[PDB]
Amino acid sequence: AQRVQLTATVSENQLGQRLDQALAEMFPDYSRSRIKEWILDQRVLVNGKVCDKPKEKVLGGEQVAINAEIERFEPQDIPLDIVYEDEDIIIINKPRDLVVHPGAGNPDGTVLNALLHYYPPIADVPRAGIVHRLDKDTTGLMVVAKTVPAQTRLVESLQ
RNA sequence: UGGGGUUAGCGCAAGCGAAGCUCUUGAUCGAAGCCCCGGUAAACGGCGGCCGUAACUAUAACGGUCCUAAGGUAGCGAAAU
């Protein structure tokens, strides 16, 4: 939650169009659907009045004020079956339903997040030292080099 | 209102031109209707895309977007591609 006021004035080139679009150009960081849900939440004021109809036609000469909240990967505790661990290489047996790289929808609970929790400063190496990808539905051995010179030798070996 | 035709007359003429009549452009009056606003879907109708995730767990529901008003609720799935 990041409660920051957002007030802006609509120009004269948004004539005859709806509410979701008008806030979109003036606020590039937030798109139509993100704007749409907050409109339905009765937390956006137009001309000092709250609106309930996103399909309204607004042209100009209006002061819209959004008074609401706004908002790398947080590590999570995941059980990992360590096979071999030392100062240069890390051999891990990846269990079932565990993806090696988080995406849009899995901020925490992956191999990279678990490795962050397992060793905090592991974020120094790119991609937390993973060299090859593997499907989450498939279990098997995964190799991670602890030190960054080992990263260069490993990627060159696969080439 | 404007213009044209005709002519009592004014002009030794070219022409102009009173009144009346006529033809034509058409200012003001001019509502409905058309749009416009809010409802009306047991009215006619519509409930789709583009990127990426698992879920194929007991029930099939979760994110990020288009220029759309809106993306399928339960029910039942091998269905109409």
UniProtKB/Swiss-Prot annotation:
Active site residues according to the UniProt entry: D135
Disruption phenotype: Severe growth inhibition, makes only very small colonies. No longer synthesizes pseudouridine at positions 199, 1915 and 1917 in 23S rRNA. In this strain a miniTn10(cam) insertion has occurred; the first 196 residues are present followed by 12 extra residues before a premature stop codon.
Top-level taxon: Bacteria
Subunit structure comment from the entry: In late stage pre-50S ribosomal subunit interacts with ObgE and DarP(YjgA).
Name under which the protein is recorded: Ribosomal large subunit pseudouridine synthase D
Physiological role: Responsible for synthesis of pseudouridine from uracil at positions 1911, 1915 and 1917 in 23S ribosomal RNA. Other positions are not modified. Uridine isomerization occurs as a late step during the assembly of the large ribosomal subunit. Member of a network of 50S ribosomal subunit biogenesis factors (ObgE, RluD, RsfS and DarP(YjgA)) which assembles along the 30S-50S interface, allowing 23S rRNA modification and preventing incorrect 23S rRNA structures from forming.
Family classification: Belongs to the pseudouridine synthase RluA family.
Recorded consequence of changing D135 to N/T: Loss of activity
Subcellular location: Cytoplasm
Domain S4 RNA-binding: 17-87
Organism the protein comes from: Escherichia coli (strain K12)
